Amino acid sequence: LGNY
Amino acid sequence: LGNY
């Protein structure tokens, strides 16, 4: 979730 | 900002 919202990691990059 | 949050670059890598």
Coordinates of N, CA, C and O in Angstrom, one line a residue:
Chain A
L1 N 0.9 -1.2 0.0 CA 0.0 0.0 0.0 C 0.9 1.2 0.0 O 1.5 1.6 1.0
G2 N 1.0 1.9 -1.1 CA 1.8 3.1 -1.3 C 3.3 2.9 -1.1 O 4.0 3.9 -0.7
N3 N 3.8 1.7 -1.4 CA 5.2 1.5 -1.3 C 5.9 1.7 -2.7 O 5.2 1.4 -3.7
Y4 N 7.1 2.1 -2.7 CA 7.8 2.3 -4.0 C 9.3 2.1 -3.9 O 9.8 1.8 -2.8
Chain B
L1 N 12.8 15.1 -2.8 CA 11.9 14.7 -1.8 C 11.5 13.2 -2.1 O 10.8 12.9 -3.1
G2 N 12.1 12.3 -1.3 CA 11.8 10.9 -1.5 C 12.3 10.3 -2.7 O 11.8 9.3 -3.2
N3 N 13.4 10.9 -3.3 CA 14.0 10.3 -4.5 C 15.1 9.3 -4.1 O 15.8 9.6 -3.1
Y4 N 15.4 8.3 -4.9 CA 16.5 7.4 -4.6 C 17.1 6.8 -5.8 O 16.7 7.0 -6.9

